[PDB]
Amino acid sequence: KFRVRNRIKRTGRLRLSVFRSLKHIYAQIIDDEKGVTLVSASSLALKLKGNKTEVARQVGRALAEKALALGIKQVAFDRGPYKYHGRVKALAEGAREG
Amino acid sequence: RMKYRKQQRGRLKGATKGGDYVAFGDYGLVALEPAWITAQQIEAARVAMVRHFRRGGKIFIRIFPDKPYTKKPLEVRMGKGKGNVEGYVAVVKPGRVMFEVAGVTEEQAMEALRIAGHKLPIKTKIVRRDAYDEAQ
Amino acid sequence: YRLKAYYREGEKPSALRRAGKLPGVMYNRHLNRKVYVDLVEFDKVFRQASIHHVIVLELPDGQSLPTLVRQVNLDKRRRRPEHVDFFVLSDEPVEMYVPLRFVGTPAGVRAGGVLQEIHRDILVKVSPRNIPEFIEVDVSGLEIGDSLHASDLKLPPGVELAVSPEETIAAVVPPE
RNA sequence: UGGUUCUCCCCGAAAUGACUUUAGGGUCAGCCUCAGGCGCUGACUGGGGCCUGUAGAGCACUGAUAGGGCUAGGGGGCGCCUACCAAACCCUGUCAAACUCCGAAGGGUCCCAGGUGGAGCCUGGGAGUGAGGGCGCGAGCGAUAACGUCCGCGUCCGAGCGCGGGAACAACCGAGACCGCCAGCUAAGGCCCCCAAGUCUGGGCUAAGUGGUAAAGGAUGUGGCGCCGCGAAGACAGCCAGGAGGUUGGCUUAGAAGCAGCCAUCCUUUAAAGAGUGCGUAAUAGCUCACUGGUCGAGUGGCGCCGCGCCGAAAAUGAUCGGGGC
RNA sequence: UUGACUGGGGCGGUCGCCUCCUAAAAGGUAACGGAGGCGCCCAAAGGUCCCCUCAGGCGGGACGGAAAUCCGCCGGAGAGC
RNA sequence: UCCCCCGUGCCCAUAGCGGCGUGGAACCACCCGUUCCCAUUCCGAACACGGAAGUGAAACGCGCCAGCGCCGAUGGUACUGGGCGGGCGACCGCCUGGGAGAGUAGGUCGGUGCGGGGG
């Protein structure tokens, strides 16, 4: 089993919980200490193309505008099994860096 | 016959554990006063027990020494006693059932235990059964 | 058997105890009440009745409840009951211990050796309408050797043994 | 080490911690007193919020444990087999300062309140103390010895050897003495006399002078309650009479043929039923009911808790509960 | 000059620090009371990022104990530190 | 509104183990491949990328079951702040507040916010 929880090591509020399926990637901005979610940007549960990586971006841009819209910026990335690689949000806007 | 030992005297308060119930056997020997019973005593009783009815039934000794009884050599003061020397003992709080017999007549059984009591440094009482259990 | 069970109001358990009563309690998934009887009473009944046979209490107001004693407490110094919980029976299949009887005389006399009632009475799941008085033990062909346990009993109908099965229920051993 | 001189008033300790060639000495802290300053924050109490790991209790880990079961292995002839000799493992029972699945009362602290007290807090002047002791409760050491010894919480003595009680008596009971009174109420403990106040009024127990302070263990010592017999199937005590037949079955019989000792516990048969509890020797041979009629016509045998008492109980100058005497 | 403690002193033991217990559920707490350590060690045994999860028990496997190394289940911690 | 499912948090075993049928349209997974990114002390097993043919057998989701596990009263006691008697003592007992642990009855194969995709 993977006890990953690479997260849990999230203390500076605002979590960009991702989630790669086997076709669609979902990202989600969440507030801890007070369990609730705000910004969201799925893969095909949205629409756009059929190419993972390619999509993985236009799917992140999504969070950008969407988020910035309601006054969001500085945050920390996320997703544990994640393995910072292919899946990506390498995009402007959010000051989550990376 | 084990563990790290030469322990603290400690004391015997109320006999909140002085009062079980015949577990096996048929008749029994329950204690009335609290005390430390030297193994020397147990045997000295048990023996006379069996010995009272040569080639008889079964004897059950629920009490069991494990507490080390220390003692000084006949001098003054300087660290705990040589300890043990004489040996170990078991702690009996008024009510505990020490010995219990079975497989024999009450005339034989009852009279058997009576003797034991003389060996023990306490005051005893003899019991039958039919009492406690967990049935319905 | 039976015996008055006067409703316990709820005041000074000792007062009773000392006075003459004997605090108790009756209950099941439905009922739960404070009761009290009388030493001489309860004794005279239990001493022989115990908790193997059914007990029916006569509540001051008509009531006639079928019960059994699930547990009684003792005042260590000089065995004397302190409390009693009564199981108000009904119809649902219930658990309970039933007595056993060892008849005959298994080899063990030439040189001696006596048995050892390893489980006087056992619990077996059964429906109230049927509640065996005592069960039989056809053991008498075993010496200092082994012993019987579990499913070695002619457990009648509705007597699905409620144990392991494996509980050594008897054994014969050497003398002194 | 000893000594240290007039008077009154107010408050009043300490005998602990740390470090000390320190240990009957000393430095700082703690407790005392004085001056000034701050003013409800004091002790204690109520209601909330957490902290805790004891008493109990409990085996879930660490160990210990009696019995049975089951079972690697290991002795013994040796394949089968055989007593837990015996691993783990499952029950039944348990034990533990340095074990805990659990866990009180209680204790600690913060907040809000009550609380004007020889309460508090801040600064400064002066100290003494640093030799404690008893009692109660909780633990070590001891021997569940010591007016023993160490700690912990409290208290009293210390400094209240001032007052009442306890015969007397630092610390047990009562109670904190500015002073005066030939006034009253009460504490403790007392009310037969010494000796103030009932030979007070019911209801019971005890006959030892218990009371007037000793144990295991003993006895139909007394008084009050209980359960088992079982009594026209009318013995419970005198008492009559049989004192049954195969019983005289077992190693040892030299002798068990109860009246040697280890194996029995059947039968015949009725007065009834001794599979013999009893005086013996060589067994055996005899004795009494442990069974039954006649009268006799009634409470009798068997266990068990409770109150009081009795035996157990021997020391040294003359004895006694403080005395007398009950 | 030739120490102190010490149920008299001498002899004996001890003298600082760490950890359990005693210790009475906050701290703290004695005794020549019970029971063990320390007077060092790591240049990786330290940083950070990224991965992995033990010990046992049960089968199955050439040499192969009763754990050498493999494969398969079970095993929340009894290993490790 | 009420269903289904993919992410997530919270309560922290009454959601656990083990059984018993079900779900593939969606989702999810397993699958299809190893050219590229990047991979395993050797293995694309795991990480990873590219694809979607086939499957619900694994795994996960959802239900039912009590045999194991976990929970678990009420009563009643043990012990106990505080106060207090008896006895020479060892110890026993009452008053006033608190009050387990075991064991019984019994309960349980979850509960619940947030955001999404589908009828």
The amino acid that residue A32 corresponds to is: D
Whole-angstrom distance between the N-terminal and C-terminal Cα of chain C? Answer: 41
Are 3 or more Cβ–Cβ pairs between C and B shorter than 8 Å? yes
Q: How many whole angstroms separate alpha carbon C76 and alpha carbon C82?
A: 10
Are 3 or more Cβ–Cβ pairs between C and A shorter than 8 Å? no
Alpha-carbon dihedral angle through residues B50, B55, B59, B65, given to the nearest 10 degrees: 50
Closest chain B residue by Cα to residue C69: B136
Three-class SS state of A28: strand
Q: How many whole angstroms separate alpha carbon C149 and alpha carbon B20?
A: 26
Three-class SS state of C126: strand
Rounded CA–C1' distance between B13 and D302, in angstroms:
39
Q: How many whole angstroms separate alpha carbon C70 and alpha carbon C147?
A: 29
> Which residues are B88's β-sheet partners?
B68
User: What sign does the dihedral A22-A23-A25-A26 (CA atoms) show?
Assistant: negative
Resolution, angstroms, 1 dp: 6.4
Experimental method of this PDB entry: cryo-EM
Residue B101 tokens read as 């017999």
**E-assigned strands of chain C?**
2-4, 23-27, 32-36, 55-58, 64-67, 69-74, 81-87, 97-102, 114-115, 121-125, 135-137, 160-161, 172-173
The DSSP letter of residue B121 is S
Q: Is B135–C77 a contact, with Cβ atoms under 8 angstroms apart?
A: no
Residue A14 tokens read as 């605002």
Residue C41 tokens read as 């009473």
The kind and range of the H/E element at B67 are: strand B67-69
Q: How many whole angstroms separate alpha carbon C20 and alpha carbon B46?
A: 40
Residue C141 burial (10 A CB sphere; 0-12, 13-18, 19+):
exposed
Of B61, B132, B55, B60, nearest to B102 by C-alpha is B60
* Nearest CB to C76 within list B16, B130, B136: B16
* Nearest CB to B133 within list C51, C78, C79: C51
Of B123, B77, B97, B115, nearest to B26 by C-alpha is B97
What's phi and psi for C28, nearest 5 deg?
Answer: -170, 180
Q: How many whole angstroms separate alpha carbon B29 and alpha carbon B115?
A: 11
Subunits in contact with chain C (3 or more CB pairs closer than 8 Å)? B
The DSSP letter of residue C149 is B
Q: Could you identify the residue written with the tokens 């034991």?
A: B116
Q: How many whole angstroms separate alpha carbon C17 and alpha carbon C27?
A: 21
Rounded CA–C1' distance between C165 and E74, in angstroms:
25
Three-class SS state of B84: coil
